[PDB]
Design a protein around this ligand. Structure first.
Ligand SMILES: O=C(O)CNC(=O)C(=O)O
Ligand SMILES: O=C(O)CNC(=O)C(=O)O
Ligand SMILES: O=C(O)CNC(=O)C(=O)O
Ligand SMILES: O=C(O)CNC(=O)C(=O)O
Ligand SMILES: O=C(O)CNC(=O)C(=O)O
Ligand SMILES: O=C(O)CNC(=O)C(=O)O
Ligand SMILES: O=C(O)CNC(=O)C(=O)O
Ligand SMILES: [K+]
Ligand SMILES: [K+]
Ligand SMILES: [K+]
Ligand SMILES: [K+]
Ligand SMILES: [K+]
Ligand SMILES: [K+]
Ligand SMILES: [Mn+2]
Ligand SMILES: [Mn+2]
Ligand SMILES: [Mn+2]
Ligand SMILES: [Mn+2]
Ligand SMILES: [Mn+2]
Ligand SMILES: [Mn+2]
Ligand SMILES: [Mn+2]
Lengths: 289, 255, 252, 275, 271, 252, 277
């Protein structure tokens, strides 16, 4: 009836055991994992030595593939992986680490900022599923923040202030804060800003949460300076240690998160060493606006 | 009339009593205040009903002018910064007087850059020792959405160099020279540099290095820009907030 | 699974086996309230809760009832004793704890009463006190009040000796808000109250609470006094209060 | 969104919009709902898809649990409809009489809150009667006559009406009659109202037959259509009532069909009479 | 001459001296009027007990002078004590009922004469059980058609607090069966056979059966089915127990109320 | 002169003196040194006159220049602290002893000072209190003063920490007459005085004197506080005072 | 403490005490004096635990040498908490309480106070009656008083049980139930009133033949249990009745054994013997 789950942080995060992700799930098991995703927001599976196909098959229990187009500087040519998965590694087509100053790596440094995946899309992602294929031993922890806990801890005046606010999300905002400011020219059209609610409501349990993300570069109804200051304050509030779970990677871990309830980021790592990390993304169902 | 100092935070900040800033300082008083600034980096004076000229006269004990700077609301200041870090010779002391206090928000927060430096692991210390940052108003304003400037403006705000690790002239303690004005590290790519600056700013502004100052009427707070960062928290723009700053010019560069 | 450890000779229970993030069962609500009747003060460690969760916990026990408030809390008092229907339970949740000072102290007014001699007990049995914010603020140095403030803070009557509605133990109804005994001259009455307060807050009747992050302390204003000890106002402190309205008066 | 109230009947009953009962209330919202209960005596909320915990949590704004929802459904422990000759169902049928909740308790109930979880489509309307308006409409002579009268309330009396008249000694003590004023006064707005209830089987200072006949006349008077609001249930309705100002009853329903209704009861905060 | 006093029933009768014996045709007209109007009001009838009964006996036999004492007076022509055994049984008449419905063959006509009028209350109310039956919806009529009620004095007195009965009293007051819906033998109109004496429906549990009866009583005693009669001295009111219910309202027990009833026995059972 | 110590920190009982007789210079010298050391001196069986009591007092300096006074004495105080030059010694002679209550208690302000932590010593060092009869009578409930009285009872300044002119020991200058600290806000200063008073009058710093007929007790106001405990006011209590005027101010 | 006398000669109803709480020195002294005067005390609505009941009893002395406490189980229930079999060993022995007796009169130092608490009331029968042995003594004539003054009875459980049929005892039982001596006429240590020491356990007068002694005890018991000397207690839930075994007899009237009767007794050990032995 229930799968084995141990909670890893005071507010959220469950560790799951007893499931082999190389193999199909039963209807009951898929139902259990999704309820755990609703409750815990982040799930940690150890020792899941899976193929790209096995990983995506697992993800497809929970919806459909998110269309990857408009998500990277993909050159419209080709890259490393053959399957459905998003390549979130530090490797080129080469199979070995990207150059310190390449346009691909510099864009990938965006992942070091606190973000919710595909928040730059009119329908943002539901679940993201990350598999560790080669572990970089010098840094690159992945950190998760509970946006519902963060929301709850705000005072009434803040909650009343932010309730109806709308943010503009774009890859140009997140990469822009890192100094990556030149886009040509269908990129400016491909990364055209989308609207998202600052405060969102989960469809299952109806918990309210802060929809924070590096992609959010302004609040619609405010001046750019004031809006950004507010977002900075909310981001500082929401990423305090009491709302954060730090994941230390082991080989063949799978960590999956609900983008609708969380932010995440990768910490600085040594770029000269391989880091083979591969993501499956489940498309969102409904927009926030 | 005996100067008494009580330490307000684990690592820094001193509360000073027995001085009347309306009255000129004696040689011993000037020496003690500057010595406390060396030690505590931030000093808090309560109950100082002082004019603009008294504030400056107090300030001028410690050097020259960079009368007062208007930091009243009558927004870059909300970012963690060190004053005039975008100048080739950056500011020494800043002295802030509260003439009208905003009752809703507007705390001034102070971060100890020396304690922050010390808490770093020896590898990080070694990584950063010789690193140099570019500081400009264009960078700090840029964070708040001001990213385009004319050729006349580009020269007035032309970036200057400062070392990431500075050393205090008096006690020789090392400290992180962080500021919102710092937009890149000279020997690193813009994104890699800004990420390191982010990590250092995050580390250096944890609660264990931070003193939060809650304002009272006629409060004077003074700080060493060479040893600290500071920021003002969001305040109700509708209500008058009258804060007046005296600034002591720097007496040496960092590079 | 509720377990209570007694913390002081006369009173105070440390409660384990409850997660206050979750709604109480009717049985748990009954157990908690009976423990409040018995111990008068309950300490709950490790309760990392929200304002809403705190209030929800409180509302099992009844209904809902800055600088001047904080300062007055440094004097021995019982909450809202200046109201004709005074407070039942108060609840304090430690969100940010000041490391220097700010212990909260509690005194068992039932034990204080019991320790009085037979003649003192007979002397004070029918006495009535006048309670007002003007008296407690007076002690802090604010003696002058405008004509509309005088109505705003019009003194209320309270029995000096009250009886608990559940176990019917008598206790001394002492409070910084009490500034007069009705049947006595002003100075004699205040001297009697001063001696009663000194008696009632001897270390044998006092529990000292040294705060830990996420503590929740709930106390019965009908059986106790409390005070906060001196602390450095320049340090961060974040203590969140909930108060349950009184369900009965002491006089008319 | 803030609270709006719409009048549903000449003298009483309000329909409330703008409140989500899945969410904890602010102090202001608790105040507004209570004042509205004082004025309207019965409040109707539509579209409140709530859990038991959420229902109780809403209820606890207004006091304490009466000595954990009360199961006023027609269902057994297995979740299926009770048999029509089962002792549980025969007691539940007591709600079909005009009553005020816990009037057999020395300190009787304040608020009752009833949530429709599964609606029976064949009957089972809940009717409410305004005991204040009913009192006011009496002539001066009747008001003077009844002013100081006291009733005896017990489960033995309401269940007696329905055929259960023989009680063991344990039961006679467990259901020992309590005293209640016949004319009560609301603690907030001071309006007088008839404290009528099926649990009332006697007036203290009168013969049992003369008392019951007087009670029958007051009940007939107080439950004329002019003082009565008829509630037709929709799924996830919540109707809450002040037992201190009203009577209520459930109309006959089809016992073969499920009727899942769940009550939260706030304990009384003051007696009507000493004992 | 008959003047109709209410929407569905009740006739006021003029030009008849109840002191004088009735002709064959007058006995027929009065009875046909009772068939139609269910209740008849006679004004100014200063009649003796023997004269009252003589009028009654035109319509059948006495139910086992021969008049029923429905007064508030004791054996000495004086108002009864408020707490006395007889008065507390008289109070049974304050409940809506049909006369002798607890007898296996229930009463036909009842004839009440006003000898001394209590001026403080004590109106007699009548309810038309035919109009009441008619106003019910089709689904209800279907439900109630074949139902059978248990009638006993133990039930009506039970309501007023007399629940404890001896083995000997339990035989004297043994419940009788009566149809819930009865058909008048003359005009064939269906009517609700409601009564305070009815305490059970045969095929149902006591509580559910009693709840059904309450709903029926509530429906049937709405003001639209009820005629209120205010008493004048030497009034006589007669009713068909087979088509009606009646009750007396609260009266001042300190003041005399001398009312005398003549009961014609039933000529048919309902079961 | 033989001296017996009566409390852990202070108080000496003196035998070998007959106060009906003039003191020799040596006797006067030994008594004053004993006053410096013990702060309070107890002399049993001195059946003396007013004139003899004053003559005895006058060895130690000069004379200092109602119901309310007796009531004020129930509060912890140092005599004449509301005067710009406050009392040196006070002397109390027991002519008629009330059997019910009326113990006189003494608190050692030097021992009280010593036992404070370094932070508090640093905090208080240069603080200055305002002392006035309006403050002490305030605590008894008399808060309203005409401008005539406000001049008569004009507050005077005293050091919170004073130093004894002979042995140089620091001590807490506490008194019921002190109602404000000059450099602090009114409530915060009063709260600080309250904490210091509570600290200084703990049992470890207190000598309780139980009166015996013809006792004389002399105390140094510069080193102590004192108070009288409650007694039955309808019984006679004849306690005669002599006061030696101060010989040095604390500030200005 | 308020006391209302409930019978001509004795019995007091007590108001003002909550027996869930410790007594003060004054409260304990008042209760004991009330016991000296009224011999039987009735308390209503005392919803107490075993520990609380015993704590109340311990005010007046020490304990006498299903429940798991100091209390004597005088219920009709077995270990399982259900009514005993009507033919069982324990029940037939408990029926002993239906005879007029004074508690522990078969011990060399007999009981002081007994305190009985009603936890589950039997609805059919089970009244507890009490007889005033002092009033009974007073009403005897001068000659009878003179005759009995120095008589001594033998008390044993073998005698009380013998009268209900159990006449056969082994050597072991005969030693466990070895008869003890008690004065027939006893004196109260406080007010010095003489009273008849009657009991179902008394089966012999020492100086007389068994038949003549038993006939004399019968005459005294008949005299002493006349309605004028007897108070009848009808039980209510959480009643507590306390009696002085030194001045009274008591008995329980027959009760419906198929229904639970949960009655719990605390017994205070005697503080003085009646004979030196
Ligand atoms: O590589 C990492 O640890 C960070 N991952 C992501 O941001 C991602 O896959 O969405
Ligand atoms: O106004 C404030 O509190 C912030 N002040 C400054 O940043 C400043 O004057 O340099
Ligand atoms: O500890 C505190 O903050 C003071 N406590 C109180 O008096 C209170 O909150 O009611
Ligand atoms: O079931 C119904 O409609 C009526 N319910 C009640 O009487 C109740 O819950 O108190
Ligand atoms: O006395 C009355 O008016 C009531 N009449 C009857 O019920 C009757 O006599 O049948
Ligand atoms: O009377 C007493 O016990 C003490 N009196 C004094 O305070 C005094 O005379 O100075
Ligand atoms: O059970 C009873 O009523 C009487 N009981 C006793 O004899 C007893 O407990 O001593
Ligand atoms: K600046
Ligand atoms: K308060
Ligand atoms: K009920
Ligand atoms: K009849
Ligand atoms: K003085
Ligand atoms: K025995
Ligand atoms: Mn990501
Ligand atoms: Mn600045
Ligand atoms: Mn408080
Ligand atoms: Mn109900
Ligand atoms: Mn009739
Ligand atoms: Mn003095
Ligand atoms: Mn016994």
């Amino acid at each position: 009836m229930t799968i084995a789950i141990r909670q890893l942080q005071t507010h959220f995060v469950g560790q799951v055991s007893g499931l082999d992700l190389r193999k199909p799930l039963t209807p009951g098991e898929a139902r259990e994992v999704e309820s755990a995703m609703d409750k815990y927001a982040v799930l940690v599976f150890h020792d899941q030595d899976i193929t790209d196909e096995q990983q995506m098959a697992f993800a497809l229990n929970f919806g459909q593939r998110e269309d990857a187009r408009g998500g990277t500087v993909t050159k419209e040519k080709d890259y490393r992986l053959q399957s459905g998965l998003n390549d979130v590694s530090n490797l080129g087509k080469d199979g070995k680490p990207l150059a310190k100053d390449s346009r691909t790596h510099l864009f990938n440094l965006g992942n070091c900022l606190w973000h919710s995946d595909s928040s730059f899309r009119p329908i943002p992602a539901k679940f993201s599923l990350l598999s560790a294929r080669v572990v970089n031993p010098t840094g690159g922890n992945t950190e998760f923040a509970d946006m519902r806990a963060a929301y709850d801890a705000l005072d009434d005046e803040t909650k009343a202030e932010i309730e109806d606010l709308v943010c503009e999300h774009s890859l140009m905002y997140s990469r822009g804060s890192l100094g990556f400011t030149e886009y040509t020219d269908e990129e400016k059209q491909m990364f055209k800003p989308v609207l998202q609610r600052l405060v969102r409501t989960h469809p299952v349990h109806r918990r309210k949460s802060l929809y924070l993300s590096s992609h959010a570069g302004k609040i619609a109804s405010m001046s750019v300076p004031e809006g950004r200051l507010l977002l900075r304050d909310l981001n500082e509030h929401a990423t305090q240690p009491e709302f954060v779970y730090v994941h230390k990677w082991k080989l063949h871990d799978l960590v999956m998160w609900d983008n609708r309830q969380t932010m995440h980021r990768v910490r600085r790592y040594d770029q000269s060493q391989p880091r083979d990390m591969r993501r499956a993304t489940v498309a969102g169902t409904e927009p926030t606006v």
